[PDB]
Design a protein around this ligand. Structure first.
Ligand code: HDD
Ligand code: HDD
Ligand code: HDD
Lengths: 725, 725, 307, 83
């Protein structure tokens, strides 16, 4: 059924977004390999040139019809071909994850910069030339597997390391703290954020009564709520967010020394988030935006890269801060404990089948390896129970490690047997130890510097059996305040806006008031600006609440801001080029040449599909229409010259610019395209953030690419209130 | 931990029963191979020289202890090694089969004698050089997976053929008919025979009210009930029973011609059954006796062999018989339609792990291949729905064909995706057809002579949509009567005893009377004989019920008897040798040499464990004692000469002989061994079936092996009441 | 279909073993009540005088045939009555218990002799007039749900107390100790006594290599092994064996004082076991002998009693 | 059988008939109804064959399929009239 020209089928080379249909990773990049991807070969199933069969291997002659008694007669029970096909269909679905159901994943590899054997015996960190395959799943938290990507939410960032000494799963989030202190409260918190149980509304949103009810009653939540209400809660891409393990864990070296450690991922593409209006509209225009962007970046060669980093605290410093190291609502400011760079992780191939590899993957923070260990963090402690347990229903049984994506690439042998869907056929005469009948194989292995058995660090435990929160955990305001004061003025404004927007959707007014009261214990300016938007007036008492203390003398920590310290990297970003029916090919040449030199992609847009022909006869295929791929999905907009009259009174073309303008994106206007300055009210002598010139050229591209390096035009904020867009 | 002399490890070569501990098939017989066993290699897991790990590949240091706070303190929730191991244990079991839950399985291979391409295009039957791997599971029907082997029950005989054109499952039983006509009634009959629902008694027995209630009210059951009540219901081993597909199926040749077919398996070892007292006793002494016999035969190189046979009826002969070919309560007498030999099956390797290969195996009579097709048999029709449906809970979901033992060895490719425990990772860009994006692969294949798609035979259907039994099925007594008349008089007596014992356990006297009434419609002598064991007296009306008509002129068919035509073979049978402390080592040499020569095994027994020395100094190792390994488990008993004084007086030795005598087993006595005649009341002149002489040979061993070939000494029956055992 | 005389139906009065067909407890003894049995009334389904229906409440006209095109024709996919009946049958079974799969259970009640409030605040022990419904399941350990009752084995004795302040399950055995010290070894011991993995033999028996391999290498097992090898391993009936919680637990009183406790059940019918040859022969003549004995004792009014 | 975990999905409260339902079906995962019927099969005499089939009738009768004539060969074939 394919067309003549082979163009049903994508080129198996890197291609920019939109240049080719997307494809399964092994067909797209068949030369991209690693030990884990190779090991999946036993279960990869091709298709070309094969006969269509039942699952039992019987060739089907007619896959268009049920078996019936006469061609208008009833379907017959003996049609086993229909019933196998429909049975398999009828049982496709499995329970989605209780939380982080929505997520997107890829393969890649990790390697350390130098050996860490002085601080850890973990084998995967032992040698700068020893590469460890990874599989990474990014996710939201609240919504179902079919909810939208660019919600306001925390994001999950889970890395499965297939090491020589075991699977290590580093199961983190994109903020450095969690909402709650003790795992016992997790069902209460998750139920409060999830859709409400009477009507199962709202999907993918904290903006509802039950969430803000819980928050207002549990001030320990305020720190992660601050991060969620900031632009952290709406990342531009999974490539442009930070990742954190949250908990303090331990590194254990060959000599037995424990060092406390917190884990960080630093996005090498820099930190970048959307703005709210854009993020919310994008949930409607492309609810798959982050899934798509990640797949397309990998297909293009813009591999997501992250630097693993460790905050390291000696054991004797456990009590030296003014917060508890074991409290997952508290961060360790980098001004106090810097992040030591550890290694680099590159994501360089997409999966073959989303369901088989992404939906069935199982990550669990208990999956550690010798050289790592846990602490008493009471959130971390209960997570260790839940991830093994939940897999029993989600993946159908205790043999979930035999599902191909989850399998260790290193040896695994033990005495466990049976369970639903058991794949492994054990030959061992023994299924117990100690045994003589197989000479006690497989055997225990004593702990040691490498290739040793797992032994827990022998932490001293002293206390009575109590259900009690540590007094050291009972402080809730000083870290929210540190985060607040570390944000730029525009970031602070967006935080105020995020709180105001969420609370406006709370139906019960006393709940809004209680949350504003909580804000008054963090920062008066923040409390008042939220109050004003809610038509609430602070009491005298509220205006007099003493600010919480600084965090160990810190008045701000700029590492907590997305933007205070520039780190922008334009490679893999995308520009909309608004075409006309007589495009000046000299502008297009200059634009594409400069974009290509910085790995910035382009999309050619028009008022219909098909082709337009430039002034020099160059035939331009049209990627999408103005309405069909809105400015939400690109980082900047260029309008080349040519026949501007063609698009000058097109409502969609004008709206495209008004939207990109509103959302603080760089805009460049060449030649007569400068006439569009009218729709967005730019001063004749110009505006910082709008690039203009008689033609698109060297200098014009430079100015545009500098603005893109800075991500958005924050100085335009005062001007966007007036535009009706 | 293994002993210094290596005596823990079974010899990896053929050894007779009891010589070596039993072992997993690929460790016992590593040189045995077939295409299926080869393709299972990728999931087989070893053990020697490997480290003990978690399922995530983490080496375990201490597999003897939980992690606790202090060595007498509480267990910690962070012990992930304990929770993984306990979790897998906690979820070991899967539902058992609804029916046939009790069964034993082995690998083997099939080969046809000649090409049958003139009558079928089935590829596995197309070439005398085409060898087809098989996996065969034999079973009882009623009991659980943990019930006894030698119960009275029908047996299952299910063969999975891994053909080049698909899995073909031949899912049969050891009797040629079933209890019921229409699949709709299956839950009724099976509930009736199964343990009663209030108290869940009895296990593995039809001897209870509800079974006989149903039978008494559903005369269509009486034919298979006659089989079950005969010695057919207590086979000596799975090697010495017949198998039958029961239903009429079709062979379809390359030209499109349909031929009606009924399937047969002929045991090359001959047909042989236990007697009731033996079979019931063995359920107590060795409830695994048939599973053990199958395993040990294969370990010895005594492979079970069966001949596939076909009864073939041309389409135009569909109505040529007194009974409906579609009626699964009717058999086709071999005297009207002979069985044509088709091929040989040899079962030559045990599995490696019972649960993974046997318990998870899924057979379904709907799994046919091009060259075979169904008919409208209304029991068969219903089955085609059930065996697909049941696997969704039993085996966890729609991907049960990916469980290794179930996998085809030929190619399988299609558009089905997902489902719980999905192993195959599909790389096809398309998961639908028709598609252009993968040029419509995998593709449909037209039907053809070889390697073609499945098309159903275009049988003509005409009639209204009815829930109605065909009147042609409404005859219940002629087949039961043919079966009865074809039995020898000792077989007839055993049938009488079978009904008599079962009905004796029915509490409600009226159910017994109604079953006696049904018997009077079959045969008066059989009815009177059961009535008299039950203290029931036939009425005048019952005494005058006209017998049912013969079956197409036949008043008997000897192929229906176990024994009427000698087919007895001795290879793989076992003789008890009752030792004394001074054995005539010349007797032993001749005995074992004649036994060896015929492939008969020997088991040396004495009054205690350890050893004895013969007349010439030879050390005789003792396998077990008289009391420890009773006669129940052997086929004959030899008592050699020597110091008979040593055990003439022994209660165990005497009992051994009285049990063996009561169970109709051949006995041979040499020299003073003839003293034993007293215990079993033999007269001096000798008795047919008791072998005697001065020395244990000349023709003392030809005589005894001749008795063994005839299986049991039927003539002894009139004398066994006299002996209290 | 019932006989004219009515002899199909067992009398709703206590009768000795074998005098009447056995029957569902609420039809055999409809006036034996306790609070639990009363609370199950919402889910008990009768049958007499009701029409045969699908599970969706649709009356069935012909429960003897599938729907087919002609009376000798193929079965039609549209027969929802057949498919529902066969679907339910096809999915009847659930996984059996990993251990103690073979067991027999009965309803009853517990009452204390005196208030134990000086040593425990447990509400079901606070007053001798406090009656606590129980459900008790007795079991073997090794064999499947289909295995024989009078095997040599440890027996389970599990009591569910439906108290006014929560379910208390007292999950014990018939000997006062267990085979092993630390729960991490439970899968090793259980795998060793269970049928061996290659061939799944032997059912309901410790008499095999792997069991004795483990015992010989783990001397902590020897105490319970001694009990299993004694006639304790072959009880005459569940009414004539002891029960034990094995572990030391704590009682906590209202003042917060903790007392260590080990739990016992003393059979008021006394202790009695079979002898080996009799037990082993019974596994063949009546593999349901203890299940039968329990059910029939209760039917006769010979109620199992334990202190 | 997968989505709602077994063949007793009709006992999940929202799914329950409000009219009588009785039959010989037993067990299954999540089984809520405790059947007191001495019989779990029909035909039976031990419960006088209850619950009983009901002939079709103008009201409260058993289900019987309309006796449509069926005539043709067993075919996997789209009707030309659908083309
Ligand atoms: C005690 C319960 C509990 C608590 C306190 C947490 N979680 Fe969790 N989390 C789960 C119980 C859980 C889970 C129910 O077990 C999930 C869902 C299904 C699954 O496979 O794991 C899960 C999934 C889940 C995933 C998705 C992994 C994937 O992509 O499959 C991430 C990234 C996180 N969690 C991260 C966190 C972080 C950073 C936490 C706080 C610091 C946290 N979880 C607290
Ligand atoms: C409509 C239901 C139905 C009917 C009428 C039959 N069966 Fe069946 N049979 C099943 C429904 C079933 C089942 C529920 O589908 C089983 C149990 C679980 C499984 O895997 O299949 C099964 C198991 C089963 C097994 C065990 C296969 C194995 O070893 O795993 C054999 C040998 C048979 N059957 C043979 C027969 C024969 C010879 C029948 C009469 C011709 C028959 N069955 C009628
Ligand atoms: C950590 C594993 C483990 C350990 C050390 C034990 N058991 Fe257990 N036991 C189980 C894991 C288990 C189980 C897997 O959880 C079962 C099987 C299915 C179930 O519902 O509970 C069980 C069932 C079970 C039953 C059957 C309950 C019933 O009738 O349904 C009894 C009577 C016991 N056990 C008694 C004991 C005693 C007295 C023990 C030692 C003092 C013991 N168990 C140790």
């Amino acid at each position: 059924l394919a067309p003549e020209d082979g163009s049903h089928r994508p080129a198996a080379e890197p291609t920019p977004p939109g240049a080719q249909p997307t494809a399964p990773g092994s067909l797209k990049a068949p030369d991209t390999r690693n030990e884990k991807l190779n090991s999946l070969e036993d279960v990869r199933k091709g298709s070309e040139n094969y006969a269509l069969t039942t699952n039992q291997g019987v060739r089907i002659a007619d896959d268009q019809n049920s078996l019936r008694a006469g061609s208008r007669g009833p379907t017959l029970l003996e049609d086993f071909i229909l019933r196998e096909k429909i049975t398999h269909f009828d049982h496709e679905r499995i329970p989605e994850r209780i939380v982080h159901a929505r997520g997107s994943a890829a393969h890649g590899y990790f390697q350390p910069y130098k050996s860490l054997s002085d601080i850890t015996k973990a084998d995967f960190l032992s040698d700068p030339n020893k590469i460890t395959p990874v599989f990474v799943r990014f996710s939201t938290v609240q919504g179902g597997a079919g909810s939208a990507d660019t919600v306001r939410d925390i994001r999950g960032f889970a890395t499965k390391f297939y090491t020589e000494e075991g699977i290590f799963d580093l199961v983190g989030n994109n903020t450095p703290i969690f909402f709650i202190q003790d795992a016992h409260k997790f069902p209460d918190f998750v139920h409060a954020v999830k859709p409400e149980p009477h009507w199962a509304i709202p999907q993918g949103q904290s903006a509802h009564d039950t969430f803000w009810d819980y928050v207002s009653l549990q001030p320990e939540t305020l720190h992660n709520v601050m991060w969620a209400m900031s632009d952290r809660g709406i990342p531009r891409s999974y490539r442009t967010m930070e990742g954190f393990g949250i908990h303090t864990f331990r590194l254990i070296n060959a000599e037995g020394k424990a060092t406390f450690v917190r884990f960080h991922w630093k996005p090498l593409a820099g930190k970048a988030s959307l703005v709210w209006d854009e993020a919310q509209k994008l949930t409607g225009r492309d609810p798959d935006f982050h899934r798509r962007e990640l797949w397309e970046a990998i297909e293009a060669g813009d591999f997501p890269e992250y630097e693993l980093g460790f905050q390291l605290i000696p054991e004797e410093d456990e009590f030296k801060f003014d917060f508890d190291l074991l409290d997952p609502t508290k961060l360790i400011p980098e001004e106090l404990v810097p992040v030591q760079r550890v290694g680099k992780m590159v994501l360089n191939r997409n999966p073959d089948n989303f369901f088989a590899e992404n939906e069935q993957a199982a990550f669990h923070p208990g999956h550690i390896v010798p050289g790592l260990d846990f602490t008493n963090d009471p959130l971390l402690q209960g997570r260790l129970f839940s991830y093994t347990d939940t897999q029993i229903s989600r993946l159908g049984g205790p043999n979930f490690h035999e599902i191909p994506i989850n399998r260790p690439t290193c040896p695994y042998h033990n005495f466990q047997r049976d369970g639903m869907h058991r794949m492994g056929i054990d030959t061992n005469p023994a299924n117990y130890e100690p045994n003589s009948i197989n000479d006690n194989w497989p055997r225990e292995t004593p702990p040691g510097p490498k290739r040793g058995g797992f032994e827990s660090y022998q932490e001293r435990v002293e206390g009575n059996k109590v259900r009690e929160r540590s007094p050291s955990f009972g402080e809730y305001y000083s870290h929210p305040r540190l985060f607040w004061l570390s944000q730029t003025p525009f970031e602070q404004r967006h935080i105020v806006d995020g709180f105001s927007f969420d609370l406006s959707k709370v139906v019960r007014p006393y709940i809004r008031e209680r949350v504003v009261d909580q804000l008054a214990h963090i920062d008066l300016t923040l409390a008042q600006a939220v109050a004003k938007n809610l038509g609430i007036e602070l009491t005298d008492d509220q205006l007099n609440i003493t600010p919480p203390p600084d965090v160990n003398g810190l008045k701000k920590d700029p590492s907590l801001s997305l933007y205070a310290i520039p780190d922008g990297d334009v490679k893999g970003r995308v520009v909309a080029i608004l075409l006309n029916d007589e495009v000046r090919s000299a502008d297009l040449l200059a634009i594409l040449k400069a974009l290509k030199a910085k790995g910035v992609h382009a999309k050619l847009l028009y008022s219909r599909m098909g082709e337009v022909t430039a002034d020099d006869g160059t035939v331009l295929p049209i990627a999408a229409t103005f309405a069909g791929a809105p400015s939400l999905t690109v980082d900047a907009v260029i309008v080349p010259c040519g026949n501007i009259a063609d698009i000058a009174d097109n409502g969609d073309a004008n709206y495209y610019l008004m939207e990109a303008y509103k959302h603080l994106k760089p805009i460049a206007l060449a030649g007569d395209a400068r006439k569009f300055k009218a729709t967005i009210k730019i001063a004749d002598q110009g505006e910082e953030g709008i690039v203009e010139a008689d033609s698109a050229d060297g200098s014009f591209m430079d100015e545009l690419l500098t603005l893109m390096a800075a991500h958005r035009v924050w100085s335009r904020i005062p001007k966007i209130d007036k535009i009706p867009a």
